[PDB]
Amino acid sequence: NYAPTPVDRFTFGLWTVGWQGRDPFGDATRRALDPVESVRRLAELGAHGVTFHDDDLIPFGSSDSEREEHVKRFRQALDDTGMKVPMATTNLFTHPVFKDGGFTANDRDVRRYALRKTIRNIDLAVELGAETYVAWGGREGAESGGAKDVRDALDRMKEAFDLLGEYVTSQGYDIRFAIEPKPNQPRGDILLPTVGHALAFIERLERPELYGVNPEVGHEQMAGLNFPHGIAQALWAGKLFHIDLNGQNGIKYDQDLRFGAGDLRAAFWLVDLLESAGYSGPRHFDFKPPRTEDFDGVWASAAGCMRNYLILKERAAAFRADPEVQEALRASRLDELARPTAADGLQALLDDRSAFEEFDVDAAAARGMAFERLDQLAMDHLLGARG
Amino acid sequence: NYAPTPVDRFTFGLWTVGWQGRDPFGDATRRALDPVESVRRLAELGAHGVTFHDDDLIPFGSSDSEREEHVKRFRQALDDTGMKVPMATTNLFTHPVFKDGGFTANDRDVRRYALRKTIRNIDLAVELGAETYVAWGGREGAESGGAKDVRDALDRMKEAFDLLGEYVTSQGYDIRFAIEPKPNQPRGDILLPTVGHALAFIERLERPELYGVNPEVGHEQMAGLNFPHGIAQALWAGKLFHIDLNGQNGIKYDQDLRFGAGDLRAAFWLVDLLESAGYSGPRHFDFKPPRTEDFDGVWASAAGCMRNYLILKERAAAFRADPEVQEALRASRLDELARPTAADGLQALLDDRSAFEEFDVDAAAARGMAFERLDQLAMDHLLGARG
Amino acid sequence: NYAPTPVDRFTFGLWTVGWQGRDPFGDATRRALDPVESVRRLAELGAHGVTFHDDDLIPFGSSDSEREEHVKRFRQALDDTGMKVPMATTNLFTHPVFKDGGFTANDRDVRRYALRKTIRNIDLAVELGAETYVAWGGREGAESGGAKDVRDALDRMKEAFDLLGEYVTSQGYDIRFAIEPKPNQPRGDILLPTVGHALAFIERLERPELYGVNPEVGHEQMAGLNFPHGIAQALWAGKLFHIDLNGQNGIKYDQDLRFGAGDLRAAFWLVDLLESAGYSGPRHFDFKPPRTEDFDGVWASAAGCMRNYLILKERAAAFRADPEVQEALRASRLDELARPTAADGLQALLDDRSAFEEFDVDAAAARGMAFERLDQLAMDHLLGARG
Amino acid sequence: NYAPTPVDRFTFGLWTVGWQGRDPFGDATRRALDPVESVRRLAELGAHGVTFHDDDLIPFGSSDSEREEHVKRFRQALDDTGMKVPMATTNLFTHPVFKDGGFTANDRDVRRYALRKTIRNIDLAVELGAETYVAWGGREGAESGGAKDVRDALDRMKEAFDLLGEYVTSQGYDIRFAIEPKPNQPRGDILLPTVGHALAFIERLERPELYGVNPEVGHEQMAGLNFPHGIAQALWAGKLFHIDLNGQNGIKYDQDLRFGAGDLRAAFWLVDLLESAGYSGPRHFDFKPPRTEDFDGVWASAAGCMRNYLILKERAAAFRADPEVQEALRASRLDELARPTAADGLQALLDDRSAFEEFDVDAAAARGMAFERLDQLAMDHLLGARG
Ligand SMILES: [Mg+2]
Ligand SMILES: [Mg+2]
Ligand SMILES: [Mg+2]
Ligand SMILES: [Mg+2]
Ligand SMILES: [Mn+2]
Ligand SMILES: [Mn+2]
Ligand SMILES: [Mn+2]
Ligand SMILES: [Mn+2]
Ligand SMILES: [Mn+2]
Ligand SMILES: [Mn+2]
Ligand SMILES: [Mn+2]
Ligand SMILES: [Mn+2]
Ligand code: NA
Ligand code: NA
Ligand code: NA
Ligand code: NA
Ligand code: NA
Ligand code: NA
Ligand code: NA
Ligand code: NA
């Protein structure tokens, strides 16, 4: 049951199942995986595709001949399996040169290098067929207040993204960018810390249509925010270009648990929203099998990501299709929420005594919302406990 | 020392010093204050002005004659003291009718009433000379996932703000709106939970120039965010129309401590930013004297808000003016952060071997940022411990 | 299905279903309930009993004749329904006199009054058959560092609890005390903020056997802690005298959602633990139907508390009984965790070369824990998705 | 000014200034330091001593001859500088063998090895003169609910600490143990997550007098707790055997900022408490110079730890010595908090009409606490802004 197929568009970063287990306090617990291995194993589980940072696919500092051979082997694995590469990204965080940032490093020479490193990988992403190019500015930020003038940093961040937009336009590429917010870690505070901040920033770019967000479940939850709500705002803005799925237990370091772990009910409401809205992008997992696991546990954890999505999809669909739930949604006036407040226009509203002088506030206030019965129907559907 | 004067533009909500002390678990500990009392006492402390919700000034349900008398007494107090009213707002949260929201209530009749209540108070705000009209949508949100379709709610929120913009335009008013984000409380999750989400929303309004943000120190800190960083993004966007100053100890219920309490170093960096950027708006305190206090403690707490701002202003100015700090800022390359990455343009960057093939990443990575010495100079300045 | 019976020992505070909906920002949305109404309605839902603060049952300041009549009516309702009263507590938080605390108020006269108020209610609790007397010191704490010397406050808190222990001993009562931790709210920080702090404090009382903890799901989660882990430590100490069940979404104000809401997987692991350990006390709900609800929603929310416990009980039992899970637990060495490390004793351990010189650390480190497969079996059982 | 001397008992872990800068997302930014270098540089800054994990001083897997040479060089550096070694600890977290724990690993063979590794290092600690042996069980815990039976794990943790107590007793050593709590990171949840949980656990050990706590500023703040309050409870229990000083910005990953950074006012109240209580142990810094820094920044950050302690010590002493503050403390009834509630005894309290029938609750409730004026005096003293 719940068997994923490539139809489901489940994708995984090479760095997810390939995470060797080094953490702030601990050495690696697993050997490095050859990307070819990961492609073949993920395909066997029913994944649709993989994603990569430049330096996951091509060791940093590789010669041109080494680069070609790494890409050739990877492409053979993709061809052997039918796996796709819908998204790629740049590693602008691991190498010590990026310790104060890539695009917003105080040192101008580093900012220029970061751009050149990204541009090289955009070309590769396009060659591999990627539709989306993600940017996670994990080093953009500060541990202290004097270290980073945020207005200046936002100017530099806009300059960088504008140059990248000029680049893809000039090359006729169809790829689009997706900015991945995170509130903190590894920097004390990261610039563009939430979906909202990233959406707002995009509106100030020179070609805003080329940029959207890549929200990650656990990152919004590191600020204690409601991930489904943030996804709804991104969808409302037309900016949900990609998504990172995982689990998180609240306000902690970024745990990258398998999807469905962490906040299970938020996972349910997320899947309900994505499916109801017809989100058509990859269902991408940015997760880490815990370092307690051997490779069998790696593949079990990856399989669990997809399984949990599919269980939740089934339960959310059953919730929405249940005539009792539809009745409860009407009892709670969800239908009214979807209707304009004043399609009659401002003057009609101002002239409408039913909206003021003759509005019976106490009668209105007496009406219960019936939200608890609705939510218990949702719980019963999630748990398969209807009756 | 540190004596406030009206020049400093310190303002207070009537509901701040007037908070009677009722909390989720406790009855009022102080009697209600007459707004006239608050105006006169705040003036004696050196405040510049006050702000109000409609229902702080005019008891809910007042007749037209009662409304006129309350306003007349208030205006006499303002005239007697020289106090100004730079901002007003609507109470769309206390009355039970607003239990599921004002502008985004599921019930359409409530949404219409909320708009009419706001419009009535915009007229009053203009009559009292207010430049800014704040909206804190404290009831907009949900405790459960099925209760609120966030895309539909954002449609309703946009409709409401668009109607208000049409209203002020049609009346020729110069007032502008400032949306106040909060992540949660009293709703389980509040819509537009951070400065970023509010900034992003504004960009989708029909007349975006009429709307900005009213960020509150403690509200961003309830999501664990960096308040100075968020203010910097608002300033970068040209949207810091007003600000609410207070203190908060991290991820808790909204404490509304006096300004300077809570995160003291964030208060320092905030004042540094506001003063450096030349923010010209009110320095408004949205705080609550703790319910442990009698009225002498109320006025002590209000005086402390202003005193702490002025101490921090002095220390931040001394930091920025210190030649040793200026040297440290250059050592940390803050000057370079402010210079364009690639004013030479994209093609020149692509052709620049110093940005890629000839960039010595290891030499760059070896350079220390000297951020710790800079931050210790900042600490020494804050504490008045230079030497 | 999942129909509660009095056998299940589900209990509710009068103040739960009776919460009128006043919050930090909002007036009551529901009328007050007569305790008799609540007893009868809860009995109809299959509850076993109720609990009370003194001032929930007897209006503060009642005359002796009024007190007798309130108790008489309540006892008739209990007799009419078969409902029990297993626990009672004192309200040492609502009245303004308790604004700085009850037992740890700085004012000695208030501390003495708090003790007398508690003692009066202990007598009533015993008359009603209560086995446990809870103490939630919600006002014990501070908003500022100078206001409360915590060592002195702990001396006063110990003195108070020691006097209460002397009292019940002197009267020959069998009741025992259960201290309810909370980290913050309504005080900026509350004394004894977690299960651990309360357990540690109890060990320093003169008659430690008379005192245990009353942990509340949401309170530990307000510190981001693992509630099942804390319950395990309380059970390990022999101190889980009572429990408060509800839901919470992380680090926020105390939401008191119905049980099962909030962190659903933590609710699953909690029920698994309570049932596996044979916890024999009340399954008490300290929750608040949201203020959006009318009375039908109140009773739906209360019914949902019990329903969710029973669903989770079924799923946890099925998990533990599944031979595949039992195999996975052995694969993950849960059996070994339960066996002594060194029943052979210290000298044998020191002499055992297999524990040091001949321990193959790399072979040990290569063994995977298989925790992800175990956790996915747990997820499948919770969701009823085995297959 | 504020120049540290060995008199001040400032100590640093080798792993603090020696942290190479590897984080969850980034490679090392600094070369490894020879412990001899760190001892000499710290001495030059005015430190009193250093501390070590076994594997900071002796590379893991060293031969007996290598071990002797590393220790000999270290002891020469200590002798050359006058630096002391007051505390040592075991690394039971870095090596992959400890991925599920040391003392509470599910695998019994690992638990036995962890004990043997600790015992070997206790012998070395004693030889170097350490008074305290710290245990930070960073790997004790879980990412999933089924992986770790917490009651069984607590049994294993007690067994381990009891064996260590038997060991030191049998050898006649005067060293004592200090358990360091942390709520999470690197495990999803760590056992003994707070000072309270550790204090409670200690009470159940066979020789409780041999064990205390080593609380760390940032670790309690990762649960949003009040660090000074927790230190007060540890002092009240007689269990503050050692302390780790650093800074943290709230509920995040463990930042290990220099002391004084993070929550500055909590740092002030901590120093006030330690000095007022006469804490006589090391003022130990467990911090990490940010990876942005070169070695000059490492030493600046270490110097800043000590400087900030000394500034705060001065300001707290001035606060306590100020006759205006002493008056404010009396106005706020801090003197009364320190006096017994009922030294007259239970019967006298029960017979005292002034404690009940004749207690004027409304007159008591009208008295203000004057906590805000007290706290503003504290702020003025911290900032050196009295006047
Ligand atoms: Mg629709
Ligand atoms: Mg500039
Ligand atoms: Mg067992
Ligand atoms: Mg004393
Ligand atoms: Mn992540
Ligand atoms: Mn991601
Ligand atoms: Mn607030
Ligand atoms: Mn505000
Ligand atoms: Mn609660
Ligand atoms: Mn409770
Ligand atoms: Mn730490
Ligand atoms: Mn430490
Ligand atoms: Na700039
Ligand atoms: Na979209
Ligand atoms: Na709509
Ligand atoms: Na602005
Ligand atoms: Na005392
Ligand atoms: Na127990
Ligand atoms: Na056991
Ligand atoms: Na002590």
Coordinates of C-alpha atoms in Angstrom, one line a residue, chain A residues 1-2 29 224-225 249 251-252 258-265 287-290 292-294 297 300-301 304-305 307-308 311-312 315 365-373 375-377 379-380 382-387, chain C residues 1-2 29 224-225 249 251-252 258-265 287-290 292-294 297 300-301 304-305 307-308 311-312 315 365-373 375-377 379-380 382-387:
Chain A
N1 CA 0.0 0.0 0.0
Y2 CA 1.1 3.6 -0.4
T29 CA 29.0 7.7 10.9
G224 CA 7.5 28.7 15.5
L225 CA 5.5 29.7 12.4
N249 CA 10.2 19.4 16.5
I251 CA 12.2 25.8 17.9
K252 CA 15.5 23.9 17.8
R258 CA 11.9 12.6 7.5
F259 CA 8.7 14.0 6.2
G260 CA 5.7 13.2 8.5
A261 CA 7.9 13.2 11.6
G262 CA 7.9 16.3 13.7
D263 CA 4.6 18.1 13.5
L264 CA 2.4 15.4 12.0
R265 CA -0.8 17.5 12.0
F287 CA 16.0 15.6 5.1
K288 CA 18.7 13.7 6.9
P289 CA 18.5 10.1 7.9
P290 CA 19.7 10.3 11.6
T292 CA 22.3 6.5 14.2
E293 CA 21.3 4.7 11.0
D294 CA 23.3 2.5 8.6
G297 CA 18.1 2.9 7.7
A300 CA 14.0 3.1 5.1
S301 CA 13.9 6.8 6.1
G304 CA 9.2 6.8 4.8
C305 CA 9.2 10.3 3.5
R307 CA 5.0 6.8 2.3
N308 CA 3.9 9.5 4.8
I311 CA -0.9 8.4 3.6
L312 CA -1.6 12.0 4.3
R315 CA -6.5 11.0 4.5
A365 CA -21.4 37.2 18.8
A366 CA -23.6 34.5 20.0
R367 CA -23.1 32.3 16.9
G368 CA -20.6 29.5 17.6
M369 CA -18.0 28.8 14.9
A370 CA -18.3 25.0 15.3
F371 CA -14.5 24.8 14.7
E372 CA -14.0 22.1 17.3
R373 CA -16.3 19.6 15.6
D375 CA -11.3 19.8 13.7
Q376 CA -12.3 16.5 15.3
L377 CA -13.6 15.3 12.0
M379 CA -8.5 14.3 13.4
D380 CA -10.7 11.3 12.8
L382 CA -6.1 11.7 9.8
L383 CA -6.2 8.7 12.2
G384 CA -8.6 6.6 10.1
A385 CA -11.0 6.6 13.1
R386 CA -14.3 7.7 11.5
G387 CA -17.1 6.1 13.5
Chain C
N1 CA -16.5 3.6 18.4
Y2 CA -14.1 4.9 21.0
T29 CA -17.8 34.9 24.7
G224 CA 10.2 23.0 24.2
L225 CA 10.6 19.9 26.3
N249 CA 1.7 24.1 19.6
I251 CA 6.7 27.6 22.5
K252 CA 3.7 30.0 22.9
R258 CA -8.1 19.7 23.6
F259 CA -6.0 16.6 24.1
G260 CA -4.7 15.2 20.9
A261 CA -4.5 18.6 19.3
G262 CA -1.1 20.2 19.2
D263 CA 1.7 17.7 19.1
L264 CA -0.1 14.6 18.1
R265 CA 2.8 12.2 18.0
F287 CA -8.1 22.4 28.5
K288 CA -10.1 25.3 27.2
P289 CA -12.7 25.0 24.4
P290 CA -11.7 27.9 22.2
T292 CA -14.9 30.8 19.1
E293 CA -17.2 28.0 20.3
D294 CA -20.7 28.0 21.6
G297 CA -18.6 23.3 20.7
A300 CA -17.7 18.5 21.3
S301 CA -14.2 19.6 22.4
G304 CA -12.8 15.0 21.6
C305 CA -10.3 14.9 24.5
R307 CA -12.0 10.2 22.0
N308 CA -8.4 11.1 21.1
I311 CA -7.9 6.2 19.7
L312 CA -4.3 6.7 20.7
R315 CA -3.0 2.4 18.3
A365 CA 30.2 2.0 15.4
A366 CA 29.3 0.3 12.2
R367 CA 26.1 -1.2 13.6
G368 CA 23.0 0.7 12.6
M369 CA 20.3 1.4 15.2
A370 CA 17.4 0.7 12.8
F371 CA 15.5 3.4 14.6
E372 CA 14.0 4.8 11.4
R373 CA 12.2 1.5 10.5
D375 CA 9.6 4.8 14.0
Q376 CA 7.9 4.2 10.6
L377 CA 6.2 1.1 12.1
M379 CA 3.8 6.0 12.4
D380 CA 2.0 3.3 10.4
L382 CA -0.7 5.6 14.7
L383 CA -2.2 6.3 11.3
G384 CA -3.8 2.8 10.9
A385 CA -1.7 2.4 7.7
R386 CA -0.1 -1.0 8.3
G387 CA 0.5 -2.6 4.9

